[PDB]
Structure formats: structure tokens, C-alpha cells
Amino acid sequence: YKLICYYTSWSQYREGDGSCFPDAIDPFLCTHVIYSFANISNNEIDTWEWNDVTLYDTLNTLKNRNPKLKTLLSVGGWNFGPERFSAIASKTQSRRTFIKSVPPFLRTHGFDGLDLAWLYPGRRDKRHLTTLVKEMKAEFIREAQAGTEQLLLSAAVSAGKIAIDRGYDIAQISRHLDFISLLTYDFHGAWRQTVGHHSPLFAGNEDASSRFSNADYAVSYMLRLGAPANKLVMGIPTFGRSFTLASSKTDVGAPVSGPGVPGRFTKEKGILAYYEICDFLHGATTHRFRDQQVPYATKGNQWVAYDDQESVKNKARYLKNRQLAGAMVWALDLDDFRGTFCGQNLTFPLTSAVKDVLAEV
Ligand SMILES: CC(=O)N[C@@H]1[C@@H](O)[C@H](O)[C@@H](CO)O[C@H]1O
Ligand SMILES: CC(=O)N[C@@H]1[C@@H](O)[C@H](O)[C@@H](CO)O[C@H]1O
């Protein structure tokens, strides 16, 4: 099984224990580690933070300890406009420029592959998104003629039924991608004035309609669309989403007035790192959606949807039972990487939990 783990560059600026560097990563934890967000400049893949080539370096040395490790640089991201991605893909010229600029870049920095994080292509981009994947992979094939191991190519893909139908020619791009990562953690959130869990596993017979909003549906659909199970990798979050309640109500559907207060370390509203969630639990009331098998806690006017060790192990058994290629953990830097925030001293509890399951039969 594969364990694709994301590391975000901007997690370096978090204060105190929040601060996270490539060197803080267990090199035997994952099978592939993806560095979060390179940019695009003058149609050429480029760096983002000032000290990226230093961190690229830090990160890639981990292979000195674990030679089986593979690293990938991911382009796009959120703070990266999809229009930009769009303007580039639609002009065979600007597109071709970008492509020819990629191999050398990764080769110079020690990466084994590129990861496309085009964040949500439109109805208009589907055709181009396909061309990009194709020609890009055609380039990676032609560049291995030089005797070096062929660079890998992957994409982080939306898990929303509408999004998939709108801008993804799945049957086509599965043939060129070494693996596809499903963003199976963005089902609630996106501003929706009722409370809810963002990464539910199952449907759960409750205040329904959103039938397609759960890893399980997302997955089945991908398979129905022609994507081979051995190329699918299911996303498992390491963060929780918060909500400032609008009333003393807590159960499903409870009214929400806006996102939650920021985490002292992550400083972004509506989101809490697993380790911050570990601290939050103290003095909180835990709950479990038995139908969807994912928990939530509450304390004061704060409601949090998150994933813990059991929920995570569960999703892990699931992908194994449907025979997928593996799991994907978003934000290794949001897990208890120091292993000193969540009690029982284990470094990277959530990711470890997943690894243990993947390591059983
Ligand atoms: C963080 C950073 O460096 N971003 C730059 C930015 O000036 C620009 O939006 C983009 C377009 O060329 O190029 C990026 O590399
Ligand atoms: C639209 C965009 O994001 N690109 C900006 C551009 O306005 C700026 O002049 C240049 C570097 O200074 O690249 C980015 O900073």
C-alpha cells in the first residue's frame, strides 16, 4: 500500500511548537512525501517561499536514511488561482513551455515526480486538463530515455460529484496518472449555516439529500467512471473544521453563526490542527456520528468536526476492503508531529494509525 503524505511549506512560520520543518519528518512513516506548492512563473515551474531550495534540500535528504522513499513537488494549491492554471493549459504554447520546464526543475532539486494540485477545473477546462496530463506524461516518458528513473505524475482530485462531472475526464487521465488522490475531506464547510462533518465516511440516514457527500460515494463513483482501484488513493485529513455555534443546540443540523475561533498555533479560522484539537478536548464533550463513523467535540459555543485514531483506522480498513492503492494524509504538519500534544507519546499519531492498518493484511 502507498501512504502519500503532504507537507506544507508555510507551516514553517507557525510560532513555538507549531513551527514545522522537513527535518521533523519520520523518514519511514510514508512511502511518498509531497512538498506543498511550487508556483508558476513566466509559464515555468518555480519556487514559492524564499527558502524553498533549502527546504527542498532538507526534505530530500530524508532519502539518505530511507532509500525507498519517493518525494514529489506539487504545483497549484489554494492561494494559487485556478484561472492562472486555466490560462496556461488552454494555450498549447504556454502549456508546452511549462511542461518542458518541469523535468529539469525536479531533477535539479531531487524530486521523483510532479503532483498536479489544479484546484478545481471548470466546465471549460476539462478538455485542457486532459491534454496537460497527457503531454506532460508523454514528456516524462521521453525524458527517461536519458537513463534516469522515470519521473512520477499524480493529481489531487476533487471528491464532489458535481465537480467531478463538471471538469474531470476521469477515464482519460487515469491512464496517464501514476495515482489520483481523492480530496475526501471537503464535504461540509464551504459556508453552510448548519453544522456538519466535513469528512464523513458513510451516507448516514440523517437530514439527507447530500447523498453523494461521503468518502464511500465519492469512491464508488470514481470507480464507476473508469478509474482503476490501483490508482486511487483516498484522502484522510489531519485537521478538523470548527464552527462558532449560533445557539446552544449541538446535534445534527444545529444552527451555526460562522466558523470557529482560530487555533493559537494555526491562526486560521474554521480550522484546527489535530494537535490543537488534542488540547481542545480537555474540558469538552465528545460525540460520534455512528452512521458516518466520524466524531465531533463541543465546548462553550465551539463545535468541532474532526478525525481521531479510530475514525482514521476505520477509513483505512475501508480503502483496503475496496482494494485501493492506499491512503493520503493531508498535512503531516497538522498531525502531532512533535508527539507531545495528544497524550500517549507517539510522534504522528494519526498518520501512524493509518500506517499500522495498511501494514496488517
Ligand atoms: C510567493 C511568490 O513568489 N509568488 C510569485 C508572485 O509574484 C506571482 O503572483 C506569481 C506569478 O508570476 O509568481 C509567483 O512566483
Ligand atoms: C497576478 C499575479 O499574481 N501576479 C503578480 C504580479 O502582479 C507582480 O507584478 C509579479 C511580481 O511582482 O508577479 C505577481 O506578484
Describe the protein's architecture and organization.
The structure holds 1 chain of a larger assembly. This protein has helices at 52-65, 82-89, 92-109, 126-143, 161-167, 170-173, 215-224, 274-280, 309-321, 349-359; strands at 2-8, 32-41, 44-46, 70-76, 113-117, 152-157, 179-182, 232-237, 239-245, 256-259, 271-273, 285-289, 294-299, 302-305, 326-330. With 361 residues, it is an alpha/beta fold. It folds into two domains: 1-238 and 307-361, Glycosidases (TIM Barrel), CATH 3.20.20.80; 239-306, Chitinase A, domain 3. The strands form two sheets. Strands 1-2-4-5-6-7-8-15 form an eight-stranded parallel β-barrel, surrounded by six helices. Strands 9, 10, 11, 12, 13 and 14 form a six-stranded antiparallel sheet that branches. A hairpin with a 2-residue loop joins strand 2 (32-41) and strand 3 (44-46). One 2-acetamido-2-deoxy-beta-D-glucopyranose binds at residues 39, 41, 46, 48. One of its GO terms (molecular function) is carbohydrate binding.
List the helices and strands and how they pair.
Layout (H helix, E strand, L loop, with lengths): L1 E7 L23 E10 L2 E3 L5 H14 L4 E7 L5 H8 L2 H18 L3 E5 L8 H18 L8 E6 L3 H7 L2 H4 L5 E4 L32 H10 L7 E6 L1 E7 L10 E4 L11 E3 H7 L4 E5 L4 E6 L2 E4 L3 H13 L4 E5 L18 H11 L2
Parallel strand pairs: 1-2, 1-15, 2-4, 4-5, 5-6, 6-7, 7-8, 8-15
Antiparallel strand pairs: 2-3, 9-10, 9-11, 9-14, 12-13, 13-14
Helix pairs in contact: 3-4, 9-10
Bound molecules: 2-acetamido-2-deoxy-beta-D-glucopyranose (NAG) (2 copies).
Subcellular location: Secreted, Extracellular space; Cytoplasm; Cytoplasm, Perinuclear region; Endoplasmic reticulum
GO biological process, one term: cellular response to tumor necrosis factor
Family: Belongs to the glycosyl hydrolase 18 family.
